[PDB]
Amino acid sequence: DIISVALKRHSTKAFDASKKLTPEQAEQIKTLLQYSPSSQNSQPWHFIVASTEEGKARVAKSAAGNYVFSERKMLDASHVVVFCAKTAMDDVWLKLVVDQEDADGRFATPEAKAANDKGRKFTADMHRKDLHDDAEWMAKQVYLNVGNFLLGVAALGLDAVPIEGFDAAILDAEFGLKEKGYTSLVVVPVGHHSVEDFNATLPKSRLPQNITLTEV
Amino acid sequence: DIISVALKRHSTKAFDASKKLTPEQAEQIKTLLQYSPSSQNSQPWHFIVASTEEGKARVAKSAAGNYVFSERKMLDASHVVVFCAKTAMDDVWLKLVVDQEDADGRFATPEAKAANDKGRKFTADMHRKDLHDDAEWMAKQVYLNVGNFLLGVAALGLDAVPIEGFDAAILDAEFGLKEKGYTSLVVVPVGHHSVEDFNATLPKSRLPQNITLTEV
Numbered sequence: 001d002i003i004s005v006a007l008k009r010h011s012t013k014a015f016d017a018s019k020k021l022t023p024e025q026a027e028q029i030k031t032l033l034q035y036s037p038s039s040q041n042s043q044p045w046h047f048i049v050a051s052t053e054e055g056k057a058r059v060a061k062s063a064a065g066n067y068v069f070s071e072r073k074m075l076d077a078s079h080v081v082v083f084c085a086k087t088a089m090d091d092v093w094l095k096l097v098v099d100q101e102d103a104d105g106r107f108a109t110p111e112a113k114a115a116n117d118k119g120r121k122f123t124a125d126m127h128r129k130d131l132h133d134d135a136e137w138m139a140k141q142v143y144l145n146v147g148n149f150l151l152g153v154a155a156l157g158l159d160a161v162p163i164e165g166f167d168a169a170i171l172d173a174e175f176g177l178k179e180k181g182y183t184s185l186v187v188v189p190v191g192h193h194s195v196e197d198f199n200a201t202l203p204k205s206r207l208p209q210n211i212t213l214t215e216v
Numbered sequence: 217d218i219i220s221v222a223l224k225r226h227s228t229k230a231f232d233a234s235k236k237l238t239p240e241q242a243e244q245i246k247t248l249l250q251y252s253p254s255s256q257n258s259q260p261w262h263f264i265v266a267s268t269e270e271g272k273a274r275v276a277k278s279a280a281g282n283y284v285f286s287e288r289k290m291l292d293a294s295h296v297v298v299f300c301a302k303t304a305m306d307d308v309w310l311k312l313v314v315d316q317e318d319a320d321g322r323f324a325t326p327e328a329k330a331a332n333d334k335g336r337k338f339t340a341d342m343h344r345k346d347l348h349d350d351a352e353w354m355a356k357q358v359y360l361n362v363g364n365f366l367l368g369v370a371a372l373g374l375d376a377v378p379i380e381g382f383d384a385a386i387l388d389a390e391f392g393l394k395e396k397g398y399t400s401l402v403v404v405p406v407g408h409h410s411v412e413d414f415n416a417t418l419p420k421s422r423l424p425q426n427i428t429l430t431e432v
């Protein structure tokens with residue numbers, strides 16, 4: 001049951017390098033990334049999934065120097081996911097999304113398709129022209145994906161840790177993301193915790209609902 | 217089976233007003249809100265849970281103007297959750313979080329507690345003093361919570377729809393959020409879909425992994 005999952009999941013502080021995702025699990029984590037919801041189904045994201053030693057080493061370059069504590073997590077986990085946001089919402093992407101919805105049979109008529117496209121452009125233009133927050137808006141959808149992913153992987157019986165503790169400039173440069181139109185936001189190592197994971201045995205802590213939650 | 221949940225969940229376009237959350241479900245959705253992870257366990261959020269006719273009507277004020285299509289969703293769902301972010305990360309909140317971790321037994325020594333506080337302040341100060349993006353940083357954690365919540369509620373067998381299509385100024389004013397130190401970001405009606413939910417029967421559409429996903 002999902003509440004048990006939410007109450008028992010934790011941020012893993014150390015991974016067992018010998019314990020790999022099964023082939024099926026490796027496919028399932030990709031499914032989770034793909035099928036996250038997003039505003040206007042804008043899907044303003046790219047994922048780097050590192051599963052080779054070479055690949056994980058490249059991601060771990062972002063943790064060198066000041067973020068060194070993050071390196072072992074990135075190197076010892078089975079699979080490491082880099083969540084990236086688009087840096088601009090371009091017309092090519094908008095067309096890609098609506099054309100895909102059309103290919104998947106979501107529109108009964110050309111008018112319905114046109115209306116969907118118009119609505120998505122309205123929202124996108126509002127963020128870029130009026131709110132001046134389009135980069136932030138897209139990054140928010142990526143964080144939503146991350147939240148979906150963390151619960152999803154826990155429910156698959158996998159350990160994980162979300163990481164903001166890395167140098168995004170280094171990671172962006174390593175994978176040439178800027179030129180491709182993306183920027184790295186969160187790194188999520190996924191695998192199985194080791195006996196050295198001190199956080200596996202500690203009680204969860206959250207503020208009480210009397211502070212955070214109002215019922216009306 | 218969480219993958220089945222992810223593949224089958226959808227954004228509900230119309231709710232059956234007669235179909236209420238069970239008492240236990242109403243508690244479980246609150247648990248999901250509370251137990252979401254966040255960077256440094258900063259939990260920079262407040263939730264309004266509207267379950268009365270009066271309460272939902274107050275939220276539905278925000279579906280004015282361009283956002284009229286959101287009104288029925290907000291009024292007809294069993295429970296409506298307003299996800300809010302803090303407007304600034306203050307020292308009182310940082311102390312609240314570490315003191316709660318201490319009360320929950322996460323620190324073996326005063327030194328461990330002090331180290332946790334120091335680490336949290338380092339990260340928080342980076343955002344508020346250097347990047348001047350603490351508002352954005354906090355809003356990102358809230359969107360992560362939303363992602364967790366949407367999958368969680370689906371796994372409970374509940375329908376939902378995330379909504380950016382509302383007037384945050386109207387909502388903030390209605391609940392006096394600004395003065396309390398919060399701002400509304402996403403509204404999530406939760407309940408059961410009606411036969412009028414045209415999105416319940418439509419195929420789900422996502423961009424292919426050959427565009428969005430790189431394996432290394």
Ligand SMILES: Cc1cc2nc3c(=O)[nH]c(=O)nc-3n(C[C@H](O)[C@H](O)[C@H](O)COP(=O)(O)O)c2cc1C
Nearest residue numbers: 037038039040041225226227378379380381382420
């Ligand atoms: C942050 C966010 C905001 C959304 N806002 C709205 C909204 O205002 N109205 C609406 O009908 N759908 C809204 N949606 C639903 C999206 O259109 C939907 O998630 C997307 O088309 C993918 O479809 P699915 O959720 O059925 O998988 C929102 C989704 C997200 C993630």
Ligand SMILES: Cc1cc2nc3c(=O)[nH]c(=O)nc-3n(C[C@H](O)[C@H](O)[C@H](O)COP(=O)(O)O)c2cc1C
Nearest residue numbers: 009010011162163164165204253254255256257360
């Ligand atoms: C966006 C985000 C970034 C995080 N970055 C790190 C990190 O860099 N290093 C780390 O050890 N934990 C990191 N965490 C884990 C949090 O400390 C953790 O989620 C929080 O303390 C709650 O504990 P739990 O995840 O075990 O429930 C991050 C969490 C989130 C949501």
Ligand SMILES: O=C(O)c1cccnc1
Nearest residue numbers: 038039040041123380381
């Ligand atoms: O996804 C949608 O349908 C949507 C998102 C934002 C605002 N209005 C609609």
Ligand SMILES: O=C(O)c1cccnc1
Nearest residue numbers: 164165254255256257339
């Ligand atoms: O939650 C953490 O431990 C954390 C968050 C951001 C950066 N470094 C650590």
